[PDB]
Ligand binder design. Structure first.
Ligand SMILES: Nc1ncnc2c1ncn2[C@@H]1O[C@H](COP(=O)(O)OP(=O)(O)CP(=O)(O)O)[C@@H](O)[C@H]1O
Ligand SMILES: Nc1ncnc2c1ncn2[C@@H]1O[C@H](COP(=O)(O)OP(=O)(O)CP(=O)(O)O)[C@@H](O)[C@H]1O
Ligand SMILES: [Ca+2]
Ligand SMILES: [Ca+2]
Lengths: 211, 203
């Protein structure tokens, strides 16, 4: 009887579990709306500057419009991939995943666990995940590293992930395509990428927690 | 443990409609982003060939950006809008209170209309009928809701008298803006009574 009630509690907890998935999808959609909104404003501003510059400075006006096109192109490209499922890669899951890739590659995985980033958007998590996966894939294909260190830090208004390997960088002076892919999606989020290849390869990727 | 479960399920189920409204915003914002992409590109191609036409396209880009953000702004937090079935009932009730005769011949209900576009049409219908009650002195108000080919058309016709000037273009501008946002339209005939036709694409 309570016997049978405890049953209904679990059916209830099971449906709450599925429903929470919808809630994460609702959160991802919201993140899309916020980002599309901001890019829409930015484009607004740049096209307005361009209009004010059509006579004063036509070449600068063409440059602003070219930045408008690029913003549009790359916004649609990042949303396109997400819109049907409204699901991305979680950072906890990717971190596990790259551990497994490193183990199969027999490259030692160094990770010191510290405060996990608390209030990161599903969009920005997906971006950082895809970048971490790309940085580590590269470690495995190209570095000949013996170790690979991942640091994930919640700094002030930003999350910074560092992937450092102690192999050798095999790219040219102008290796700028996984690498451009990373830079684009991070700059789309108002973040950044830095590469040091001086002794091993160090990628630092930074992304605002929100907007 | 049990009581609270279904109280949590009872709300989280509401995400189903909210999740739909959010996809509708993402789709609309996407489209307006593309359209701004295209217009700014045409503007760029015209900087030297036709500067004044370039300026015009960029002004259209600004407008599109402004009004888009204005429509979304109101919906984003709640992700909830008015349903057309519920507004139809509501305007019945306003007309009854106003003692204006509500004429509605029921026909095929629009089947595949976006929540966003429903919310727009609802707010336009509510405005049209509010106006009927405040200004028309009509005895009848007829509302027609028609699924035409790729568009839904709602006609609100009263047999009172139009009290506005020649340039009454602010509920009316509100209507025209939000319908043009959705790629729809508004027409007013005030010849004998006031007739508003509002049209919006389904998706
Ligand atoms: N961790 C790393 N260690 C050593 N070399 C690396 C590295 N990551 C990248 N590289 C070098 O930089 C080049 C560019 O890498 P990038 O990922 O940009 O394109 P790719 O060369 O892996 C083909 P793709 O990325 O398109 O699969 C690689 O070919 C490799 O030479
Ligand atoms: N169905 C109708 N019958 C008679 N007059 C109408 C009418 N609809 C609109 N009007 C007239 O047009 C004017 C403009 O309508 P609109 O709704 O744009 O602004 P409003 O005058 O109602 C202030 P608000 O929009 O805040 O109510 C009204 O004041 C009224 O003169
Ligand atoms: Ca690569
Ligand atoms: Ca009004």
């Amino acid at each position: 009887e309570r016997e049978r009630l405890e049953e209904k509690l679990e059916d209830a907890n099971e449906r709450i579990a599925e429903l929470v998935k919808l809630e994460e999808r609702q959160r991802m959609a919201r993140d899309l709306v916020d980002t599309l909104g901001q890019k829409l404003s930015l484009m607004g501003l740049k096209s307005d500057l361009a209009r004010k510059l059509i006579y004063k400075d036509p070449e600068q006006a063409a440059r602003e419009l070219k930045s408008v096109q690029q913003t549009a192109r790359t916004s649609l490209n990042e949303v396109r991939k997400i819109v049907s499922s409204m699901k991305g890669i979680r950072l906890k899951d990717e971190l596990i995943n790259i551990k497994q890739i490193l183990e199969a590659a027999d490259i030692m995985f160094i990770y010191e666990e510290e405060k996990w980033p608390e209030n990161i958007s599903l969009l920005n998590e997906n971006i950082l995940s895809m970048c971490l996966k790309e940085a580590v894939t590269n470690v495995v294909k190209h570095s000949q590293a013996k170790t690979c260190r991942v640091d994930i830090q919640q700094l002030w208004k930003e999350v910074v992930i560092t992937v450092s390997d102690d192999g050798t960088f095999k790219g040219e002076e102008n290796s700028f395509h996984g690498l451009l892919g990373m830079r684009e999606r991070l700059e789309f989020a108002n973040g950044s990428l830095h590469i040091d290849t001086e002794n091993g390869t160090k990628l630092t990727m930074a992304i605002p927690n929100n907007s």
